Amino acid sequence: FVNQHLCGSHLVEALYLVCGERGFFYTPKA
Amino acid sequence: GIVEQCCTSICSLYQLENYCN
Q: Where are the disulfide bridges (chain B)?
């Protein structure tokens, strides 16, 4: 789930599930 | 960044939460 290599949509979904209603920001180029 | 900490290397809950609002 969380403890693995998370890339692309897989990383985006993890952030979605973990952050919940707080939301999150995704910046691949940084 | 997040890709370096979670994609190229193994992710963790500690790091993911650094990106929640």
A: 6-11
Write the residue in A7, A18, A27 that is nearest to B7 by C-beta: A7
Q: Which residues of B6-18 are buried (b: 16+ CB within 10 A; e: fewer)?
A: bbeeebeeeebee
Resolution in units of Å: 1.8
Give me the residues paired with residue A24 across strands.
Answer: B20
* Segments making up each domain of chain A, as ranges: 1-30
Q: What angle (nearest 5°) sits at the alpha carbon of residue B6, between those of residues B20 and B15? A: 40
